[PDB]
Amino acid sequence: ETTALVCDNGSGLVKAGFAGDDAPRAVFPSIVGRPRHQGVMVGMGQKDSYVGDEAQSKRGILTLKYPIEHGIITNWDDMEKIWHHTFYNELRVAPEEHPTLLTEAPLNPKANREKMTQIMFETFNVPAMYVAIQAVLSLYASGRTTGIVLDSGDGVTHNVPIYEGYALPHAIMRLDLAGRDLTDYLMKILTERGYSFVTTAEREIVRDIKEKLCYVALDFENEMATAASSSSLEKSYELPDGQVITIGNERFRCPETLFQPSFIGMESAGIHETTYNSIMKCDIDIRKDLYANNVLSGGTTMYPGIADRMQKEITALAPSTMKIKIIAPPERKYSVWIGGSILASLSTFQQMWISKQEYDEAGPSIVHRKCF
Amino acid sequence: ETTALVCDNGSGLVKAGFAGDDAPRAVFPSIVGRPRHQGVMVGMGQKDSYVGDEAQSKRGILTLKYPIEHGIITNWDDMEKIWHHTFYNELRVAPEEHPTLLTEAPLNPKANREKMTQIMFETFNVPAMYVAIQAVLSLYASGRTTGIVLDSGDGVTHNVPIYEGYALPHAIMRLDLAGRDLTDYLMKILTERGYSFVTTAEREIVRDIKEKLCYVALDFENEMATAASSSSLEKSYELPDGQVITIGNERFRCPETLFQPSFIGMESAGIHETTYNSIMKCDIDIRKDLYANNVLSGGTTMYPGIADRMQKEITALAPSTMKIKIIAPPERKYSVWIGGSILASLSTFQQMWISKQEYDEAGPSIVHRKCF
Amino acid sequence: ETTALVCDNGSGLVKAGFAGDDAPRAVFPSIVGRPRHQGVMVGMGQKDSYVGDEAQSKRGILTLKYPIEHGIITNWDDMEKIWHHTFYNELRVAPEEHPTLLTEAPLNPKANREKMTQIMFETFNVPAMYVAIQAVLSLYASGRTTGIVLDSGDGVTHNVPIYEGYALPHAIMRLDLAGRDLTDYLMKILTERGYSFVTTAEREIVRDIKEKLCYVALDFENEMATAASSSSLEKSYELPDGQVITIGNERFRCPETLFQPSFIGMESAGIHETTYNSIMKCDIDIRKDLYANNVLSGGTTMYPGIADRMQKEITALAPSTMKIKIIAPPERKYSVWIGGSILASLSTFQQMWISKQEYDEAGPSIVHRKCF
Amino acid sequence: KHIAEDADRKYEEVARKLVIIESDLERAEERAELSEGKCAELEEELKTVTNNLKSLEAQA
Amino acid sequence: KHIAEDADRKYEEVARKLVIIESDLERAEERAELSEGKCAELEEELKTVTNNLKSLEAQA
């Protein structure tokens, strides 16, 4: 059988690998770089652009930019350099031998679905491809065919109810606020404490801090009080150049913005609220499976203690005769990619791929007939 | 009514005076001096420290040190000597009779707000006080309750979107480049021309030069070309010990760093990009007033020809269906202090002051209940 | 490849020779002389000017002057007499058959780079030339592409952080103190002991003394105490006309001015302070390699025991988790010239030269396009 | 002269060996500490992983 | 003789210094090697615990 590349298009880390595996084989930063100089590096082989660990390590002669922001490809030309790095550097294989499965947000722009279809087929010469919604794959990685996924990436949060592998297209909810925003917010609130960070070389350490030290409080007022009454809600972090900084209440405040969007000037409702407002669009005979199968997904859901908080919040909005229970997979950060590996290795799914001939007949638009 | 002291905590000139005036009554250097040697003077007595025009004129046996660097109080002990000078030497009044209004940068560190609050109340015995963001006051001096302020102050730059007297806490932008590092930069680029200045006694003349001779170009490439093609972009300055020096393209290059931060190794975006990136975080119903009330504030904005440059730059970024115009006050260097005198003399504001009784009952953190 | 003449523009020793060699071919004093009176010699042919070992030996008839003072070319007419002596007397070769590489300090004046370029193409008719920063060559000679150099040369001290190629142009820091003023200082402090010197013929012996007998103390107060408590910190020197003089604490005091510029009325920061203030301007992911690889360069760094002192001083300034090391090359007095000798021999470097054709097409301005 | 010269050659031989050892000492320090940083990193990860294992054991 | 003797003093000090540099190389080698073994070790520990946690997680 043809080995598929499953490539999860993350807004902060790219997760990529071969199908038939139950885990990604490549994980690298979603960063693309270009020279500070008027040309190539002195006395060394020619490259016009740099990616991942090469861009992170050669940084002193580069300007760096991001290819994807808030679940949207914000520059085609840099998403291409992630793809070029993915096939030829990280997996060291010809993509033209390997069908491609691409992850996307719910309601990902159609002009974008097409530019992705076109770029894969014309430049990389892929033999076949498909594009799939993040939450739909995370449900398959949760071992269940019907349920709802709260998927919170490194840049967007969605609530996506699904019946027997199809997402319900009227009931989906979106919130631009998650891991990208969360770093910029964390950085603001640290400046406020008097640990001013103003440089993007600091922003990436603030990102790492966030991933290591943030935790979801079970009760926001009680933890806030605890930090005001005692300094036991603070953890030290030693920066790379020495200098021990102390991270305080910012730990739980940073992710608190997910429950209360008004903290950062947004008019949107919270992630638990948009869970409730999503399920109540669905039929009563299926609401039982949706409320019982609330699945957490994506990088932002890997903060400890999240389940007890989300269990609380949803039972408070939802009637006490829908069964309520949080499903948190063992490695929920990868569940989109794992579900993509499962889907790409089903025997019945091999009829679903976009072929190169159908692309030659209908242009990039074929994704709106073969995909959903 | 009680006469307030409005004290602008400026990074190069302290501006101070009495409220009910529409102009500062003391405008003096933000400098403190300390002896290089024991037995400082013969037949004339001694002092352990010096401030302002006394430190500038008695300089021949002094090290100079500073209260405020980068808009940030960097040494409490020098900020105190500036304050001691302000009340007892310059205005020749008891501060304990006069409520105090202190200016601050947007997002000024909270441990700093509290050390300033504590120092004012315990040592100076002030009857009441308040702390206010610089840019908010400059908007009141522009006759306005809603607008976006570029506060490019005496030593820090901010873009500050202000809505009905409140600076929006998610939409503020900061730049670590203004009238402080502009001197240090000017000095480097003169050394490059072969007018080597290495002494801090030379640096303060370079400062004066900068204030007198710098001008904002309307077009950076066209003025640069003009200086390369002709020596008509050069103005002479006679140094205070004879010797006529010629200041060239450095005039417009020095401030050029505000538009292009990469010239000095900073990763930051320019004052125009940080204007657009600020207003794009603001609500569409208030954009209509914010874009119409683009207000210039601070010492760094007093370079001629700024408005035509700023008008250009922001129309190129922001779309062509907004009321894009630049507001430049008649004496924009003082608009913080003037707005502080206006605020301190409103009949509705007199409930807002931290009283000595509230400081005695609640301690230094009272600033985080009375101020924002 | 064409044999490149590498000229080290040292402020006290000229160093010269052919590229592709491990050590300089000529090492002679940076001195030029002219007659003190009308009529100068009988019985042998008179000369209008004198240079190098001829000026050092025939000294009494000469007004000696120095072509490079304070790291800056101060008299064009004497810098030409060094270069005419270098090609036709010392190496005995035609320079019009050879490319030329010139060493320079950082931030070298544009008018001086232009007058040197013009002299090379129009006084000496060279086919090609290039100009390079002392520290960049010393680092390349060491077998490295990344590090910070403390280049304490003959006439000036510079701090120069370098990464994977060129120096970082915003981060460089300067001090107007090295081997030049060290002699004049040594001479003052000997007069103070009662070994008065007045003749510039005495100053050159004081120079030699300085190079032989000065040593960097590891602890300034403890060595000072030792000399006050015992005469074991004194070494004898027999002058060239008999008379045994005793050199005391002056040995470590002389170079002590590098750490404390206030000893000689300067306002500047010390060599360790300007090292730390330079590295703190660099990007965080390269601060690691810059703090780890602190490199010594120049004649003034050849005083024994310097590494343990500098190791101390920098660890006290910089935090204790970038793991500091002092790199002191085996022949760190010569590493500038050796770096030029290595670099000018490479096939990759032959594209960097300023040609006589580019000087005919663009004039003296070409050096600011070709040099980095 | 002949004696000085023979001391200079030897001193230059020892010097040449010395800079090889100094470059090799520097690379030996840099690698030692980089491994130590990575070793600390892996220790923070086992330590978290354990705790998640101990939280998971109470759940299980 | 003076020129020979001073050259000898600096080279002899350089020699005394080389010997320290040599001891220091040895000490870096021992640390570097040891820490890479501790990393290899810690990866095998982290791997066992993680495989073990995975098998439990899967029973969960």
Side-chain angles (χ1 to χ4, degrees), chain B residues 185-201:
Chain B
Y185 176 71
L186 172 50
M187 191 187 175
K188 192 182 71 75
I189 62 177
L190 276 155
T191 303
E192 297 170 54
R193 192 189 184 81
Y195 300 139
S196 184
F197 301 118
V198 176
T199 326
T200 80

PDB file of all heavy atoms in Angstrom, chain B residues 185-201:
ATOM      1  N   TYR B 185      23.008  57.095  19.968  1.00  0.00           N
ATOM      2  CA  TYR B 185      23.080  56.824  18.539  1.00  0.00           C
ATOM      3  C   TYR B 185      23.689  57.920  17.734  1.00  0.00           C
ATOM      4  O   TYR B 185      24.416  57.606  16.848  1.00  0.00           O
ATOM      5  CB  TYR B 185      21.762  56.331  17.929  1.00  0.00           C
ATOM      6  CG  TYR B 185      21.704  56.121  16.471  1.00  0.00           C
ATOM      7  CD1 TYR B 185      22.453  55.013  16.030  1.00  0.00           C
ATOM      8  CD2 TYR B 185      21.042  56.898  15.491  1.00  0.00           C
ATOM      9  CE1 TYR B 185      22.487  54.636  14.703  1.00  0.00           C
ATOM     10  CE2 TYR B 185      21.048  56.585  14.159  1.00  0.00           C
ATOM     11  CZ  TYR B 185      21.744  55.411  13.802  1.00  0.00           C
ATOM     12  OH  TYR B 185      21.735  55.048  12.432  1.00  0.00           O
ATOM     13  N   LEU B 186      23.357  59.175  18.060  1.00  0.00           N
ATOM     14  CA  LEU B 186      23.860  60.320  17.307  1.00  0.00           C
ATOM     15  C   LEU B 186      25.338  60.390  17.443  1.00  0.00           C
ATOM     16  O   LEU B 186      26.108  60.666  16.493  1.00  0.00           O
ATOM     17  CB  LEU B 186      23.169  61.603  17.698  1.00  0.00           C
ATOM     18  CG  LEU B 186      23.703  62.894  17.130  1.00  0.00           C
ATOM     19  CD1 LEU B 186      23.915  62.921  15.651  1.00  0.00           C
ATOM     20  CD2 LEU B 186      22.793  64.029  17.633  1.00  0.00           C
ATOM     21  N   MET B 187      25.818  60.155  18.685  1.00  0.00           N
ATOM     22  CA  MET B 187      27.206  60.170  19.084  1.00  0.00           C
ATOM     23  C   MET B 187      27.980  59.097  18.346  1.00  0.00           C
ATOM     24  O   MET B 187      29.067  59.270  17.821  1.00  0.00           O
ATOM     25  CB  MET B 187      27.284  60.016  20.594  1.00  0.00           C
ATOM     26  CG  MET B 187      28.610  60.229  21.409  1.00  0.00           C
ATOM     27  SD  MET B 187      28.557  59.802  23.236  1.00  0.00           S
ATOM     28  CE  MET B 187      30.281  60.023  23.766  1.00  0.00           C
ATOM     29  N   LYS B 188      27.424  57.883  18.201  1.00  0.00           N
ATOM     30  CA  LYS B 188      28.100  56.803  17.446  1.00  0.00           C
ATOM     31  C   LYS B 188      28.360  57.199  15.984  1.00  0.00           C
ATOM     32  O   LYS B 188      29.482  57.112  15.495  1.00  0.00           O
ATOM     33  CB  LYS B 188      27.296  55.491  17.536  1.00  0.00           C
ATOM     34  CG  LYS B 188      28.119  54.296  17.021  1.00  0.00           C
ATOM     35  CD  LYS B 188      27.346  52.969  17.053  1.00  0.00           C
ATOM     36  CE  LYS B 188      26.229  52.859  16.000  1.00  0.00           C
ATOM     37  NZ  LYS B 188      26.749  52.616  14.630  1.00  0.00           N
ATOM     38  N   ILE B 189      27.342  57.720  15.308  1.00  0.00           N
ATOM     39  CA  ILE B 189      27.348  58.051  13.896  1.00  0.00           C
ATOM     40  C   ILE B 189      28.175  59.286  13.503  1.00  0.00           C
ATOM     41  O   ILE B 189      28.731  59.305  12.422  1.00  0.00           O
ATOM     42  CB  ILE B 189      25.983  58.053  13.246  1.00  0.00           C
ATOM     43  CG1 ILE B 189      24.971  59.129  13.857  1.00  0.00           C
ATOM     44  CG2 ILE B 189      25.358  56.654  13.294  1.00  0.00           C
ATOM     45  CD1 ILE B 189      23.574  59.227  13.176  1.00  0.00           C
ATOM     46  N   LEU B 190      28.380  60.259  14.456  1.00  0.00           N
ATOM     47  CA  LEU B 190      29.343  61.305  14.433  1.00  0.00           C
ATOM     48  C   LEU B 190      30.718  60.769  14.545  1.00  0.00           C
ATOM     49  O   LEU B 190      31.615  61.315  13.885  1.00  0.00           O
ATOM     50  CB  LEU B 190      29.033  62.367  15.480  1.00  0.00           C
ATOM     51  CG  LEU B 190      28.016  63.422  15.012  1.00  0.00           C
ATOM     52  CD1 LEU B 190      27.223  64.112  16.155  1.00  0.00           C
ATOM     53  CD2 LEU B 190      28.619  64.362  13.996  1.00  0.00           C
ATOM     54  N   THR B 191      30.963  59.765  15.393  1.00  0.00           N
ATOM     55  CA  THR B 191      32.295  59.149  15.529  1.00  0.00           C
ATOM     56  C   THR B 191      32.703  58.482  14.211  1.00  0.00           C
ATOM     57  O   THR B 191      33.851  58.576  13.784  1.00  0.00           O
ATOM     58  CB  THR B 191      32.326  58.159  16.705  1.00  0.00           C
ATOM     59  OG1 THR B 191      31.958  58.831  17.891  1.00  0.00           O
ATOM     60  CG2 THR B 191      33.702  57.532  16.924  1.00  0.00           C
ATOM     61  N   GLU B 192      31.721  57.921  13.505  1.00  0.00           N
ATOM     62  CA  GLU B 192      31.844  57.379  12.186  1.00  0.00           C
ATOM     63  C   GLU B 192      32.196  58.319  11.121  1.00  0.00           C
ATOM     64  O   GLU B 192      32.946  58.018  10.178  1.00  0.00           O
ATOM     65  CB  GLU B 192      30.631  56.553  11.792  1.00  0.00           C
ATOM     66  CG  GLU B 192      30.303  55.308  12.582  1.00  0.00           C
ATOM     67  CD  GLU B 192      28.952  54.694  12.272  1.00  0.00           C
ATOM     68  OE1 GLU B 192      28.789  54.443  11.014  1.00  0.00           O
ATOM     69  OE2 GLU B 192      28.140  54.507  13.214  1.00  0.00           O
ATOM     70  N   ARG B 193      31.740  59.587  11.234  1.00  0.00           N
ATOM     71  CA  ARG B 193      32.112  60.687  10.331  1.00  0.00           C
ATOM     72  C   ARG B 193      33.511  61.195  10.633  1.00  0.00           C
ATOM     73  O   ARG B 193      34.167  61.763   9.778  1.00  0.00           O
ATOM     74  CB  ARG B 193      31.068  61.819  10.427  1.00  0.00           C
ATOM     75  CG  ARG B 193      31.147  62.905   9.372  1.00  0.00           C
ATOM     76  CD  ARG B 193      30.192  64.070   9.711  1.00  0.00           C
ATOM     77  NE  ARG B 193      30.199  65.093   8.647  1.00  0.00           N
ATOM     78  CZ  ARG B 193      29.492  65.020   7.467  1.00  0.00           C
ATOM     79  NH1 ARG B 193      28.608  63.946   7.279  1.00  0.00           N
ATOM     80  NH2 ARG B 193      29.594  65.955   6.472  1.00  0.00           N
ATOM     81  N   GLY B 194      34.013  60.926  11.819  1.00  0.00           N
ATOM     82  CA  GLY B 194      35.329  61.305  12.199  1.00  0.00           C
ATOM     83  C   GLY B 194      35.286  62.452  13.136  1.00  0.00           C
ATOM     84  O   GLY B 194      36.329  63.039  13.422  1.00  0.00           O
ATOM     85  N   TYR B 195      34.128  62.782  13.742  1.00  0.00           N
ATOM     86  CA  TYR B 195      34.004  63.681  14.841  1.00  0.00           C
ATOM     87  C   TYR B 195      33.796  62.857  16.042  1.00  0.00           C
ATOM     88  O   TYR B 195      32.680  62.832  16.470  1.00  0.00           O
ATOM     89  CB  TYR B 195      32.866  64.705  14.664  1.00  0.00           C
ATOM     90  CG  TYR B 195      33.088  65.580  13.403  1.00  0.00           C
ATOM     91  CD1 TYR B 195      32.044  65.917  12.559  1.00  0.00           C
ATOM     92  CD2 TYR B 195      34.354  66.187  13.150  1.00  0.00           C
ATOM     93  CE1 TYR B 195      32.281  66.662  11.411  1.00  0.00           C
ATOM     94  CE2 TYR B 195      34.614  66.944  11.951  1.00  0.00           C
ATOM     95  CZ  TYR B 195      33.533  67.176  11.111  1.00  0.00           C
ATOM     96  OH  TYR B 195      33.676  68.102  10.039  1.00  0.00           O
ATOM     97  N   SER B 196      34.873  62.200  16.480  1.00  0.00           N
ATOM     98  CA  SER B 196      34.936  61.316  17.632  1.00  0.00           C
ATOM     99  C   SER B 196      34.636  62.072  18.921  1.00  0.00           C
ATOM    100  O   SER B 196      35.280  63.069  19.254  1.00  0.00           O
ATOM    101  CB  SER B 196      36.310  60.642  17.694  1.00  0.00           C
ATOM    102  OG  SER B 196      36.357  59.713  18.752  1.00  0.00           O
ATOM    103  N   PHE B 197      33.557  61.643  19.571  1.00  0.00           N
ATOM    104  CA  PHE B 197      33.143  62.081  20.894  1.00  0.00           C
ATOM    105  C   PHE B 197      33.139  60.832  21.766  1.00  0.00           C
ATOM    106  O   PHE B 197      32.441  59.865  21.459  1.00  0.00           O
ATOM    107  CB  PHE B 197      31.764  62.761  20.827  1.00  0.00           C
ATOM    108  CG  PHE B 197      31.700  63.976  19.917  1.00  0.00           C
ATOM    109  CD1 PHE B 197      30.855  63.982  18.791  1.00  0.00           C
ATOM    110  CD2 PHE B 197      32.506  65.096  20.183  1.00  0.00           C
ATOM    111  CE1 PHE B 197      30.842  65.091  17.929  1.00  0.00           C
ATOM    112  CE2 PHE B 197      32.486  66.210  19.327  1.00  0.00           C
ATOM    113  CZ  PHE B 197      31.661  66.200  18.192  1.00  0.00           C
ATOM    114  N   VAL B 198      33.932  60.836  22.834  1.00  0.00           N
ATOM    115  CA  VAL B 198      34.092  59.665  23.728  1.00  0.00           C
ATOM    116  C   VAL B 198      33.762  60.063  25.166  1.00  0.00           C
ATOM    117  O   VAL B 198      33.525  59.221  26.034  1.00  0.00           O
ATOM    118  CB  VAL B 198      35.498  59.034  23.562  1.00  0.00           C
ATOM    119  CG1 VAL B 198      35.772  57.874  24.525  1.00  0.00           C
ATOM    120  CG2 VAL B 198      35.667  58.472  22.145  1.00  0.00           C
ATOM    121  N   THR B 199      33.716  61.359  25.476  1.00  0.00           N
ATOM    122  CA  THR B 199      33.550  61.905  26.836  1.00  0.00           C
ATOM    123  C   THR B 199      32.068  62.159  27.138  1.00  0.00           C
ATOM    124  O   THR B 199      31.338  62.653  26.276  1.00  0.00           O
ATOM    125  CB  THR B 199      34.343  63.223  26.980  1.00  0.00           C
ATOM    126  OG1 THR B 199      35.530  63.216  26.221  1.00  0.00           O
ATOM    127  CG2 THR B 199      34.746  63.523  28.419  1.00  0.00           C
ATOM    128  N   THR B 200      31.576  61.909  28.356  1.00  0.00           N
ATOM    129  CA  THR B 200      30.169  62.235  28.685  1.00  0.00           C
ATOM    130  C   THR B 200      29.932  63.753  28.739  1.00  0.00           C
ATOM    131  O   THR B 200      28.840  64.220  28.423  1.00  0.00           O
ATOM    132  CB  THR B 200      29.647  61.547  29.959  1.00  0.00           C
ATOM    133  OG1 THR B 200      30.056  62.202  31.136  1.00  0.00           O
ATOM    134  CG2 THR B 200      30.064  60.081  30.078  1.00  0.00           C
ATOM    135  N   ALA B 201      30.982  64.537  29.010  1.00  0.00           N
ATOM    136  CA  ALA B 201      30.986  65.991  28.814  1.00  0.00           C
ATOM    137  C   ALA B 201      30.746  66.423  27.346  1.00  0.00           C
ATOM    138  O   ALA B 201      30.209  67.501  27.105  1.00  0.00           O
ATOM    139  CB  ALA B 201      32.328  66.532  29.326  1.00  0.00           C
TER     140      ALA B 201
END
